[PDB]
Structures are given as structure tokens and as C-alpha cells.
Symmetry: C3
């Protein structure tokens, strides 16, 4: 096989040029398709052109930043030195301008909107103050991350809620997801037949979870998830001044669950501080995963609000963690180590899809079994309470009544009016004790009742609430913070870092509370910007 | 934070008094509720008052026994010395009185009831004699546990079957369970829809198993299960003279499965004797779990009889184990070590509920798959036997016919009349080979046919049997002794105690046989007391 | 217990004779039943007599071969020496006779049948040549196994397709399986109710997989599977000259999956060569399992063709593996070590049934989830392609069109006519990317459309194809070679042999390609013998 040996030698000699030429040819073919499509019709081919343009821009930008990093840093250094020189007097001016802007915004927008928005602002202040009072180290507090996180949340809310561009962008993004979750119906129909709608939840909702997990694993294989995670983490790190590890984990928990997000930085867990570990757990508790998003949307919960809350939950999580448990040590991990994220052991895209599909079995199984047990326990508890309540001629006693009269202040501070606060408190209880699959399920019923348009009150019982309250509840409930999740979180984090078991158990409860508080802060910011119809 | 430090110091200084005061306040509130309810109406608040009274009595009793144990023992010692002094001649008197009582009971009750009850007594004697003949060490037999276990079974049967108080108590207890298993319908309806009754077994029965496992895990977390287990084990230990480990395991297997019951004494397994290990396996094989109770009740099997059999199966298991495999070594474990039972790694009640729910996935999955395979094999076997039977112009040959003509003597000795013995033998075969989920399922069909009231015989084929036979079959079938369970039992017990693998394999078959024999003994005792309608 | 000791001593003294006498009595009883059945009626009892006769013949043959092996070998040796002496000139005569026979068969059968059969022969030649060109070691090729495997495939095809005896035998064998898979309906009906047909796939097809896995585990416990495996492996080893390990694995993969077949030789995996490992993987990729056979038959795929393809896939796998990756080392394992296969840890038949049933849970779960994900991805891909295709006024672009225009040459070489090649290419794509559960599912639709008898063309779209194309597709698609299976195969084989991880990853892709090529070779041989209706 002399010819075969010569061919192998030729391939070895110019391996780099051959593959580069092949990739260039593929790129040229794609560009030819795009340009031909634009030529035949432009209005019809606009989205493809836009996608290609943005991809090209990002590729060029990344290449330039990687290549000319040192030159750009050197060019920026003089301005940084001048700003540091004049900061001792410029800080007061900047702070005064920001405070004046806050005051003007309040006076000219929030007061016009009404009283409930001012109550939302007051609730924000009150939650922050309460977190400060019960802090682990109240004296050793670094206030930069707190203010920066709250400001980032406010800016995101302004751009997405009070501007036509962001509103349109996020509505479109939500609509695309709603279309995307409809593809699982093919597999559900084949496996479970054309009668798969006889059992809506089991045979139509869970397949959405399966499909979303598959797609997420495929995206992780390709590397887009890590790209977006790094882009967001750099912003949060530069503005807020947090450590790279916690910033990366917070940015990744927007898309990934609390248990699987620490895997982004597996090797460096034994060397993190207590504060970073607490921030990791808090970020896990203050966000949801992309797999369960489709189920919540199927129930009827707004997609745009869910995405907005997931985005806003990260700065709030980091700020609340830093205030609740500030840093009193020296971090060891550096930016390059944190940003590098080890992709999985998948040889090709289809293997990644299979791996993602297989992992979803336990998820759906546990979801179903826990729902069964929780609802059975709820029924038993309500029956027992009615039995006890009949002694005092009050057989209407129930879990819902107690929770409505208990969690009312937390909902009132978020800006919910007096009447609907008692209804939001029930959802808060459902989430606090059982989980968020139940709270969103009841919220969907309330939304459907409003959409139907029946009587708001029947026999003096409120049947549904307003749009603003529904949005505020959507923001408040977006989290994984329940008493049950504490054990599984601790177990997983110990399994990843056996040596840090003593530290993990110490901060888990504070992390859970901080996650709940962060959800409430996001809800308050939402409420102070939405208007009363 | 000087104020915070002062508050922390104050909390540390008087930590004990603060929590004690809080608990006292909670207790006072509960008592205030109880007394107010009684004041408003007494007949309506009676059960709450009774529950509170019994709880108070048991708490006070436990405190007194723990505090004044030494004084009570010293006070009792003189009487024990006197009894030991006079025992050498008093033993004959006591034994003669007991024998005379047995004879009088036989003559004046059993003969009046009829012949079948005398046959039941004879079957009891015969099973005991057969266990003696095939004993591992016939010469080294300690007869105290045998007689004491049989006597405890007889006393329990008298109190629960032949007295209005016990009959009413256990009927009420059974009715409460039937009400309790109806709460799972809420979760089943949500997860599987309002059409969940289209698939009765899968979508209504298994959720009962899930809910019961959840409740059992919660009770184990609270500590009531261990309380009852210790109370029963002390009685069995004092009366029968067995070792603490086997007594505890037998008392715990009333509520817990054979695989999970040894976990009550995990550390001490390597140090147990062969006899104690055999007793453990026998107790596992002679009882059922509380999770599968609801399914059997849903089929239509009597709850009171199931509870009575589960209670009676422990003394029989221990007696049959001691007779089959008596003790020839010195036990090492002591009472304090055995009674202490390590609760699980659950931080709160809801985490315990989640853990219990998750563990139930494998249980129901295996139940369903094994049922599918066993019924398919049964159909294939029956078709093949009919094919073989057609050669001799007898195409009616089947598994049921062979089992009816094979297991008939075992059912006849239990007191089942001649006609119904052939029908009970089929259930015995179903249980011996496949499992008890099948035997109870067929028994439920027979019971339903009787309740309908159709012809007892159609074309010379008996369609149903009497009430007494159904009760005797309920007692006989209450066990986990099947040829399949041998492997899983051995695997689990080796996984708990790897070093004792050689001993575990040796006694497993004898334990299985002893469990079957114990079930039959319970059935014989039931039969000799029930009357022929 | 002196009598017991005497009985035990007597049993120990003559243990061998007692059990032998018992087995002889059982055999005599069985023979008495057989003879009585024949006496009462012979035509009715014929199959039982035939089964008994063949069993007796095989038992006697095995005993004689085991006992008189040395004498038979010595008797055969002289002829072997004479043949070796005259081989140097007799080889040319034998080869010329074989070539002349091939030429005559072509001229007088294949040409008469038509052009497509000649195209099938040419495709066979072309696939072999392509495997030779891209071989790992083209110079170091041992041609005996290649020709012998192709010849064995041709002989099997002649006996099973072009002779009434083999045709009848395999049709009968297929019909028995179709009857056998109907027994699972009992378990499916009980567990999932009389409405289990509302969800055909989930509640009727997967139980077939469960039941077949149970039966396979039972057969492995009994030892028939190993008997047949050894019988086939000896033939393949003697004729082809392959190593015992790869021959055994290839013979066992007819009935067993790719992951579980290497367990037949677990200990010797670390000591195999690279070529044997490659052959193992190739055999795994070129065959199916007996558990999934029932599902394919339920869809509507021919049973006889499936069995024939499974039988023919082993010689092709070995030949293609030897040509693609020939042997350049010295094998270490010997025949006695390879043939001995360690049965599982099952004490009795029912325990084996339970073990087989439990293992089937993961199989069906993964099947269902992967199907859901794959079909959802297919729908999304088709929608996206239609969106892209509308730019050029061609909204009909799809995965199916691309695959039809891509895989067409591979189907044309197999002998499929011009029109149906584009349809077979779609099935090839479905199998190559997703899996064979999808390709057979679509093939069943095509077969059903033909059976209905509607218009072959509607609006210029072909709705179904011919019988010959359906058979060729049945042969082509019988394999587990998909891009997804690469990862699971590698993981399992590394878990069995951790030390050989470097070698396993190297040959997996070549093994996958070789499996596909072997399937195509079987299809070509099928096509060159079937006639055009
Ligand atoms: C409208 C809705 C949301 C709007 C969000 C807008 C948020 C922007 C609001 C305000 C921006 C201006 C804040 C400047 C405060 C100084 C922070 C600082 O670094 O010094 C710290 C004093 O830190 C303090 O104790 C000050 C706390 C009270 C300040 C309230 C104003 C001490 O030094 P440090 O520990 O090194 O830090
Ligand atoms: C418009 C509607 C109403 C108003 C909304 C306002 C929304 C404002 C949203 C976000 C701005 C929040 C700024 C919080 C500053 C914290 C103070 C601190 O110590 O960090 C300082 C950073 O240096 C700065 O001062 C950052 C200035 C950012 C200016 C953004 C425009 C110094 O950092 P350090 O040396 O590490 O200590
Ligand atoms: C509910 C959400 C309420 C959010 C709204 C408001 C909460 C405001 C902050 C107060 C949080 C408690 C401070 C704290 O760290 O204690 C922790 C809670 O300790 C507990 O076990 C109580 C949990 C219930 C907390 C509800 C109040 C114990 O700290 P650790 O033992 O060091 O760990
Ligand atoms: C009505 C339905 C059920 C009623 C149950 C009522 C059960 C109460 C029935 C009978 C209570 C009286 C039994 C007393 C028997 C002596 C046992 C003893 O300890 O000595 C043993 C003799 O053990 C024997 O060999 C005696 C066996 C035959 C006795 C049959 C009576 C030898 O000493 P040990 O080994 O140290 O013991
Ligand atoms: C009423 C209807 C019909 C009759 C039913 C009767 C139901 C009776 C039910 C239970 C009583 C069964 C007693 C069995 C005694 C076994 C003999 C033995 O060796 O143990 C002895 C215990 O010492 C005793 O004798 C125990 C006496 C208990 C008296 C209960 C009243 C000595 O123990 P040891 O020194 O360790 O040897
Ligand atoms: C009808 C459908 C299917 C029919 C299948 C029928 C198959 C029977 C067809 C043909 C049987 C005759 C084949 C004899 C070829 C010699 C093989 C041999 O051992 O020597 C090798 C030459 O090997 C070669 O290079 C020869 C390759 C070309 C031969 C084509 C004929 C070299 O020695 P080796 O490496 O030690 O080997
Ligand atoms: C009938 C319809 C049309 C024709 C179909 C023909 C179907 C033929 C099907 C199978 C026969 C295929 C024979 C392939 C022989 C390979 C050549 C080789 O080197 O091995 C040789 C074996 O020695 C042989 O030659 C084997 C002879 C077998 C004769 C079978 C009748 C020598 O082995 P080595 O010393 O190890 O080197
Ligand atoms: C965290 C949860 F307990 C949730 O509370 C429950 C309700 O969604 O499901 C669990 N869950 C969900 C998604 C995920 O990715 N990981 C995970 O553990
Ligand atoms: C022991 C069993 F094989 C039973 O025979 C079968 C039928 O109930 O289910 C198994 N089983 C049931 C309850 C339990 O707690 N543990 C357990 O293993
Ligand atoms: C190999 C497979 F990926 C198949 O491609 C898929 C479609 O049948 O199921 C998997 N499978 C099937 C049978 C078996 O025995 N083992 C196994 O892994
Ligand atoms: Na998350
Ligand atoms: Na038990
Ligand atoms: Na196979």
C-alpha cells in the first residue's frame, strides 16, 4: 500500500490547511445560500440575514478581543489612572447625581402611577434593611455589590417593561419558546397514542421537560451556553466586583438547575470560601431551570415575565448573599480558571441528545411522585383541620386560610393591594412548603378564571385578581427555595466536594432565606414599574 | 453590633430555659384549645379529649419508668426470689392448670362450634410436630418461646375475635385505614387526570403505595414507630425469653418490609448468631409491609383480618424459628444497644416525606413489571398444559387444577371444609410461586362473587366459598414468602453484612419454610375460633 | 435423633445413586406419557414425539462426542494428512470448480431473474472492494474468513429462500413467535386495564419486550442458549478459522444485545487483541436482540426475514471485520476457556424470571424517552428546513428529501429498482441517525399501505413500493448501528475492561461502519436471490 502511505504522509504534512480549507468552503456555501435567498426576496429572507450578521459581528469581536487584549488594556489605563486621581472628590458628585435621579424618578413616575408602587419601593428598602440587621458579619459589609445589583435589576426592568424595544424583544422571545414546546407532541403522540390528551400532565407536559433537557444538553455540547454565561458573568463581575466563581455560577443558574450549575466549576469547589459557597447555594435557590420553563408556560404562566424574572434573579441573588454573608477571607480562584468550563464526555451531537434524554427520567419520576404525595398530604391536612375547626363551629379552617393570614405582610410590601394580598399569600405558602409546581398551577387557574370573565365575587369569595398582582406573583414565585430542596442540595454539593461537608450544612438555611428574599426583591422592582389598569 | 453580641450572649447563657418555656407555651395553647372545645360541646370533642388523655398517660408513664427504674426493680426483686424458691413445686401446678384450661376450652367451645375447629387444632399440633421433627438441632430445643408464642397468639385471637371490645376496636381501626387511603385520589387525579379510573390498578392503586410509604417515613422521622416497636418487643422478650435483636426485628416487621426491617439494627448484624439471623429472615417472610396494605384493602380484602394477622405473625415467627433452628451459641448484643434505633438523615418532616416518596418508585415499578411477567407466564403455562392435556382427551388440565389437588392437605388441616379446601389450595399455589399480590387479587374476586349473590354452583363448578374460608385464607396468605424473594432477601442482607454471606445463604430456605408454616399456624388459630354460619 | 443421624449417613453414603434414580424415574414418567399419547392417537401427538426424538438424538450425540473425542480425532487424522499432502495441487481444482459454479449460477438463475439481481451481485463485490481499499492493514489480509463468510451467507440464503423445506421451517418458526408475543396481553390488560389499547405502543408493545427479556433470562439459566451458541460457533470457527472469542461473541449476538453479549467472555477481555475487540464491536453493531424482535413483528415487519437476517449477519460481521481490521498479533485465549460461559447468580427459574423482568425497566424507559426526543427533533428540523426552503420558493425541503437524494447509491447497489431506491434511502437515513425503531415503524406503514391496495401514486407521490424492496429493506435495517450507540457501547465495554479504554475508543467507528456494511451485504445476498413479482 505505497499509495496509501503516500496519501497518509501528505495528509499529515498539511493537516492544518486541509481542514481550514474545508471549513472555509462550508462557510462560503452558507454565505452563498444567504445571499441568493436575499437576492430572490429580501423581506422574506430578513431574519436569516440578521442572524448571519449578528453571528459575524460576535465572531469578529471575540477574535479582536482575544488578539488585542493587551493593547486595549494599555490604551484604557491612562483614563483609569486619571479617574482614580480625581475620584476622591468625584465620588460625591456621582453619588449625589444618582440619588437625585432616584428622587426625580420616584416623584414624577411612581407617585403618578399610584400608592402601591411607593409601597413596593418601601418594601424593597425594608427587605434590604432586614437582610442587613440579621447579617452574619454586619460590620464587615461591602456595599458596592448591593447597590450595583439593585441598579442592574432596575435598569433591566426599565429596558424590558417601560420601553417598546425591550418589550417587543422579550414578547417575541417568549412566543418562540411557546412554539418550540409544541414539537414534543409528535413523540408524545407516537409513544402514548392519539389519546395522550386524556392524561394531560403525564403524557403531554413531562415530554416537554424531556425535550428541553435534550436541547439543553445539545447546546452545552456545542458551546453556546458557555458563551452566554461568560458574557453575562463578565458584566456582573466588572460592575459588582464579585469573585469569578460565584459570578459564573449565578450567570449559569439562569439556564441550569441548582444541582447541575456547580458542575461548571467542579475542581475549584474545595478551595472556595464560605461566602462563595453561600452565594452558590443562594443563586441556586433564587432561579429556575430551562427544563421546567415549558411546563410553567403550558400551565398558562406568562413566558416574558418568567424570562425577565430569571434574568433579574442573579444580581439580586449575589447582592443579597453578599449582604447576608459578606466576605471575610481571601479568594483563591482566578478568572481564567473559573471561566474555563469542561464540556461533557460526548463524542457527537446525537450522543449528547441521548445523554440529555436519559438524565430526564429521574427528574420527571420524582416530579410526579412528589406531586402525588404533596397533594395527598394537603387533602389530609385540610380534612383534619376542618375536623378540628368544627369544634368551634368553624369548619372552613384550612391550610389556605392560615397561609393567607400569615404571609399577607410579605405580599403587601411587594405592592399587592389589600384584597389580593391574601390571595398571593396562599401561593407563597404553596411554594414555601410544597414547591413551585403547585403555586404556578394554582396561578394558572386564577389567570384562566380572569380570562373567562365570570363574576369576580361569588358568595363573597374572590375568584380572581388583577393583572398586576398576577405579574408580581410570577416574579415572586420564580425559585427553587423549598424546605424539601435543602437536603438534596446539601447531598449533591457534598457529593461534589466531600471535604466541605461541615461548611455546606452551615450556610444552607441562610441561602434558602436569601433566595426567597431575592425573589421578593425582583417582585418589588416589577411592582414599582407596572401600572394599575 | 454590640447589641447583637449581647443578645447572643444572653441566648447562650439561658438556652435551656428559653426553649423549655417555648415548648411549655405551645403545650398550654394546645390544652387551652382542647378544654375550650370540650366546654363548647363535649360529645363533639370526645375523641380529641381521649387522644390527649392517652398521650398524657403514656408520657407520664415513660418518664416515671425512666426515672424510677432501679427502685421498681428493687421493689420487685423479693417476689421474684420467693417465686424462684417455690417454683420447683409450683411449676407443676401452673402447667396442670393451663392444660386443664385448654381441655375445658376445647370441650365447651370448640366441640360446640363443630368438627372443622377441632381439625384446625389438630393441624396446629401437626405443624408444630413436623417443625420439631425436621429441626436443625432437635435435642437442643428451648420450649419456653414455642408455648409462649402460641399462647400469645391464642390470647390475641380471643381478645380480637371473641370479645366485643377488641372486635369493635379493630373494626374501627380498619375503617380508619380505608378512609386514609382515599386521600391519594387527589394526587392521582391531578397527575393522571379525571380519567385515572380508566386504568384502575396503575393510576389508583400504586399511588396508595406511594402515599403510605411517605406517611411511614414521616412517622419514622417523628419516632412513633420506634415507640410502638419497643413497647411490643419488650413484651415478647419478657414473656418468650428471646434475644433483644430478634424481638425488635419481629416487632418492627409488623409495619416494615423484610428488606428494610434489619436496618433497625444495622451495626450489630455481623455479631449476631446463626439462630438470630434465621429468626430475622423468618420474621421477614411471615409478615407484610404497611405500604402494600392499602392495595390489598382496595382489592376488597378485610382490613381487620389483615391487621390481626400482621399482629399475630410475629410470635408465631419467633416460635417457629426457635423450634426449627434453636440457639446453640451465646448472644453478644444487649438490650440497650438493640432498642436504640438510628433515625434517618432527615432535617425536617417535609424532607422525610420527599425521601419516602422517592424510594417508592422502584417498589411500584418492580411490582408492575413482575405482575406483567408472572401473568404472561401463567397464561403460557396454562395454554401449554391444555395442549398436553388434549392428548388424553382432557383439555382442562391447568396450573390451578394441579395446585388444587396438591396443596389440599395443608388447607384441610387449617380447618377449611372439604369443598373449599380445593379452592384455597389454588390461592396457596398462587402465593407460593408467584406472589401474594395475585392471591389476594383472586380472593377479592371470590369475595365479590359471594357478595353479588349469584348461584354458588354453575355447571358443577363452585363459584365462591364461605365467609370462614375467606377469613382463613386471609390469615394464611399474609406473608412475603415466595421463591423469588429468596434472592433479593439474600442480596440485601449480604449488602448490609458482607462478612456473613456464608451464613445468610445457609438458613434462607429454612426461613422461607418457617414463614409459610407460621402463616399457616395463624390461620389455624383463626379457624379454631371462628364459627360456621 | 439417632434415626435422623442414620438417615443422614445413609443419604451421604449413596448420594449419587439416589439422585440418579430420581432423575431416571422422572425420565421414565415423561417417556410413559409420550408413548401413551402416541398410542391413543399418533397424528395428534406427532410434534411431541418429534421433539422427544430430536432431544434424545442431541443428548446421545453430545455424550458420544464428549466421550470418544480422542478416538474420533485419531481416526480423522490420516485423511487430514493425505489432504494436506495433495493440497498443493488440489487447491487449484477446488477453487476452479467453485468459480465455475458461481459463474453457472449467475448465468442460469440471476440473468433469468433480471437485471436488479446482477446489480445486487455487483454491489456485493463493490462493498467488499471498498472495505479492502480502506482497510487498516491492506497488505496483511487473510482471505479465508472473507470467502467462507460470504459462502456461508449464500448457502443459508439458498436453503432458506430457494427451497421448500427451509422456507416452510422458517415460516413456521416466525409464526410461532407471533403466537408467543400474544401472551403479554394478559399482564398488560391487568396492569393497564381493558383500555390498554388506547395507548398501543406504551401499554402493548413494551410489555412484549419485558416478556421476551424474562424468557431470555430463563433460557440462559437453563442453558439452551449456550448450547446453541457453542454449536454455531464451532461451525464458524472450523470453516472460517476465526478466534474462539470472536466466534462465540458473534454466535451469541444473534440472540443477545451488543452490550450484554461480551459478558459471555468477561474474564478474557483484557487479554484480547485489537482485531478481536473490533470484531466484537462489529458483531454487536450488525445484529439485533431477541427482546426487540417482538416489537418489530408487532409493527408488521416479516418475522421470517428478521430471523434470516439475524442468522446471516454473523458471518458477514466476522468477514467484514477481518477485512477491515485484520489480525497482526498472536491470540492468547483458547477454545475451552472461550466456550465456558458463566451462568448468572440465580438459584431457581423464578428468580431468573424476576431478574430478567427487573432489567427491562431501563430498556423500555430509554426506548420511550429517546423516541420522544428524536421525533420532536425531527419535527423541529423539518419545520426549520421548510422555513429556509421558502426563501427559494421551495417549501417542501425536508430531512427525508435530503436523505433520499443522499443514500440513493447505497440502495441502488443493493438491487432496489430506480424508483424505490429513493424511498429506501429515507429508511436508511432514519436508521443511520435516529435508530431502527423508527425505520421499521415507517416500513410497517409502507407495507400496510401496499396491503390496503390503494393507488400507488397520488399527485405524483409514490405511496408504497414492491415486495422485493420491502424484503431488501428488512435485511438492510437489521442492526444497532447508529451514531448514538457509539457512546453507550464504549462506556459499557470500558466498564467491563477498564484497562483497554485506549483501544476501545480507537476501533469503535470502524466497527460501526463495518456493521452497516455487513447489513448491506446481507441485503445484497437477499436481493440477488429474490424474484421480481
Ligand atoms: C429605584 C429602585 C432601585 C434603585 C437602585 C439604585 C442604587 C444606587 C443608589 C445609590 C448610589 C449612591 C450610593 C453611595 C453610598 C456609599 C456606599 C459606599 O461605598 O460606602 C460604604 C457606606 O455604605 C453605607 O453605609 C451607605 C448605606 C446608605 C446609603 C443609601 C443611599 C462604606 O464603604 P464600602 O464598604 O467600601 O462600600
Ligand atoms: C434613571 C432613572 C432613575 C435612576 C436609576 C439609577 C440606576 C443606577 C444603576 C446602577 C448604578 C449603581 C451604582 C452603585 C455604586 C456603588 C458605590 C461604590 O462604592 O462603587 C464605586 C464604583 O464607582 C461608581 O460610583 C459607579 C458609577 C456607576 C454609574 C452608573 C450610571 C466604587 O467602587 P469600589 O472602589 O470598589 O468601592
Ligand atoms: C421564609 C422566608 C422569609 C423571608 C422574609 C424575611 C426574613 C428576614 C430575615 C430573617 C431570617 C432569619 C435569620 C437566620 O439566619 O436564622 C436562620 C433560620 O433559622 C431557622 O431555622 C428558621 C427558619 C424560618 C425563617 C423565617 C423567618 C438560622 O441561621 P443558621 O442556623 O446560622 O443557618
Ligand atoms: C388452644 C390453642 C393454643 C393454646 C396454647 C397454650 C400453650 C400452653 C400449653 C401448655 C403449658 C404447659 C407446658 C409445660 C411443658 C414443659 C415445657 C418445659 O419447659 O420443659 C421442657 C420439656 O418440653 C417438652 O418436651 C414438652 C412437650 C410436650 C408438652 C405438651 C403439653 C424441657 O425443658 P426446657 O427445654 O428448658 O423448656
Ligand atoms: C383460657 C382459655 C383456654 C386456655 C388458654 C391458655 C393461654 C395461655 C397463654 C400463654 C401462657 C403460655 C405459658 C407457657 C409456659 C412455658 C413453660 C416454661 O418453661 O416457661 C416457664 C415460665 O413460667 C411460666 O410457667 C409462665 C406462666 C404464664 C401463665 C399465663 C397465665 C419457665 O421459664 P424458664 O425458667 O426460662 O424455663
Ligand atoms: C454468489 C454470491 C456469493 C458467492 C460466495 C462464494 C465464495 C467463494 C469464491 C471463490 C472461492 C475461490 C477463492 C480462492 C482465492 C484464493 C484465496 C487465498 O487463500 O489466497 C490469498 C489470495 O487472495 C486474493 O488476493 C484473491 C482475491 C481475488 C479472488 C476472487 C475469486 C492469499 O493467501 P491467504 O492470505 O493465506 O489467503
Ligand atoms: C452452488 C451454487 C453456486 C456456487 C456457490 C458456492 C458456495 C460456496 C460456499 C462456501 C465455500 C467457500 C470456500 C472459500 C475458500 C477460501 C480459500 C482458503 O484459503 O481456504 C482454504 C480452505 O480449503 C478450502 O478450499 C475449502 C473448500 C470448501 C468447499 C465447500 C463446498 C485453505 O485454508 P487455509 O490453509 O487456512 O488458508
Ligand atoms: C428543585 C426541585 F425540587 C424542584 O423544587 C422540583 C419542582 O420543579 O423539582 C426539583 N427540581 C426541578 C428542576 C431541576 O432541574 N432540578 C430539581 O431538582
Ligand atoms: C417482597 C415482594 F417481593 C413482594 O413479594 C412483592 C409483592 O408485594 O413486592 C415485594 N415487596 C413488597 C413490599 C416491600 O416492602 N418490599 C418488597 O420487596
Ligand atoms: C442499541 C439501542 F440503542 C438501540 O439502538 C435502541 C433501539 O432499539 O435501543 C437500544 N437498545 C435496544 C436493545 C438492547 O438490547 N440494548 C440497547 O441498548
Ligand atoms: Na437555576
Ligand atoms: Na414485614
Ligand atoms: Na446483537
Amino acid at each position: 500500500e505505497r499509495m496509501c502511505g503516500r496519501m497518509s504522509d501528505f495528509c499529515r504534512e498539511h493537516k492544518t490547511t486541509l481542514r481550514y480549507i474545508i471549513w472555509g468552503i462550508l462557510i462560503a456555501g452558507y454565505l452563498a445560500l444567504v445571499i441568493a435567498a436575499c437576492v430572490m426576496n429580501f423581506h422574506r429572507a430578513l431574519p436569516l440575514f440578521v442572524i448571519t450578521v449578528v453571528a459575524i459581528f460576535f465572531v469578529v469581536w471575540d477574535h479582536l478581543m482575544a488578539k488585542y487584549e493587551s493593547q486595549i488594556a494599555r490604551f484604557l489605563s491612562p483614563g483609569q489612572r486619571l479617574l482614580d486621581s480625581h475620584w476622591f472628590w468625584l465620588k460625591w458628585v456621582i453619588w449625589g447625581c444618582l440619588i437625585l435621579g432616584v428622587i426625580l424618578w420616584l416623584v414624577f413616575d411612581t407617585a403618578k402611577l399610584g400608592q402601591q408602587q411607593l409601597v413596593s419601593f418601601g418594601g424593597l428598602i425594608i427587605y434590604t434593611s432586614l437582610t442587613f440587621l440579621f447579617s452574619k458579619h454586619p460590620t464587615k459589609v461591602y456595599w458596592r455589590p448591593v447597590f450595583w445589583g439593585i441598579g442592574l435589576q432596575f435598569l433591566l426592568g426599565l429596558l424590558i417593561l417601560r420601553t417598546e424595544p425591550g418589550f417587543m424583544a422579550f414578547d417575541w422571545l417568549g412566543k418562540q419558546v411557546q412554539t418550540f414546546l409544541g414539537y414534543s407532541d409528535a413523540g408524545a403522540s407516537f409513544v402514548f397514542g392519539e389519546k395522550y390528551t386524556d392524561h394531560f400532565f403525564a403524557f403531554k407536559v413531562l415530554p416537554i421537560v424531556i425535550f428541553f433537557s435534550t436541547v439543553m444538553s445539545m447546546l452545552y455540547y456545542l458551546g453556546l451556553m458557555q458563551w452566554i454565561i461568560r458574557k453575562v458573568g463578565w458584566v456582573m463581575l466588572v460592575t459588582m466586583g464579585t469573585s469569578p466563581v460565584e459570578s459564573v455560577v449565578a450567570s449559569g443558574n439562569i439556564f441550569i438547575g441548582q444541582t447541575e450549575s456547580p458542575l461548571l466549576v467542579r475542581p475549584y469547589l474545595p478551595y472556595v470560601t464560605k461566602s462563595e459557597l453561600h452565594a452558590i447555594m443562594t443563586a441556586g435557590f433564587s432561579t429556575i431551570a430551562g427544563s421546567v420553563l415549558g411546563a410553567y408556560i403550558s400551565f398558562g404562566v406568562s413566558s416574558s415575565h418568567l424570562l425577565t424574572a430569571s434574568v433579574m434573579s442573579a444580581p439580586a441573588a449575589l447582592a443579597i448573599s453578599k449582604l447576608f454573608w459578606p466576605e471575610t477571607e481571601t479568594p483563591k480562584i482566578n478568572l481564567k480558571n473559573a471561566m474555563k468550563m469542561e464540556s461533557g464526555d460526548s463524542r457527537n451531537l446525537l450522543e449528547a441528545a441521548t445523554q440529555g434524554a436519559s438524565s430526564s427520567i429521574s427528574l420527571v419520576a420524582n416530579i410526579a411522585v412528589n406531586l402525588i404525595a404533596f397533594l395527598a398530604l394537603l387533602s389530609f391536612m385540610n380534612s383534619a383541620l376542618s375536623w378540628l375547626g368544627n369544634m368551634f363551629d368553624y369548619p372552613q379552617l384550612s391550610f389556605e386560610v392560615i397561609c393567607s393570614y400569615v404571609f399577607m405582610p410579605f405580599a403587601f410590601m411587594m405592592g399587592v393591594d389589600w384584597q389580593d394580598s391574601f390571595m398571593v399569600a396562599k401561593l407563597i405558602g404553596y411554594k414555601t412548603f410544597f414547591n413551585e409546581f403547585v403555586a404556578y398551577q394554582q396561578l394558572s387557574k386564577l389567570i384562566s378564571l380572569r380570562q373567562v370573565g365570570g363574576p369576580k365575587f361569588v358568595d363573597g369569595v374572590q375568584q380572581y385578581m388583577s393583572m398586576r398582582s398576577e405579574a408580581i406573583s410570577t416574579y415572586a414565585l420564580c425559585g427553587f427555595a423549598n424546605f424539601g430542596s435543602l437536603g438534596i442540595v446539601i447531598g449533591g454539593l457534598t457529593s461534589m466536594a466531600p471535604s466541605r461537608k461541615r461548611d455546606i450544612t452551615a450556610g444552607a438555611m441562610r441561602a434558602l432565606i436569601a433566595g426567597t428574599i431575592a425573589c421578593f426583591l425582583t417582585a418589588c422592582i416589577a411592582g414599582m414599574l407596572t401600572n394599575t389598569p
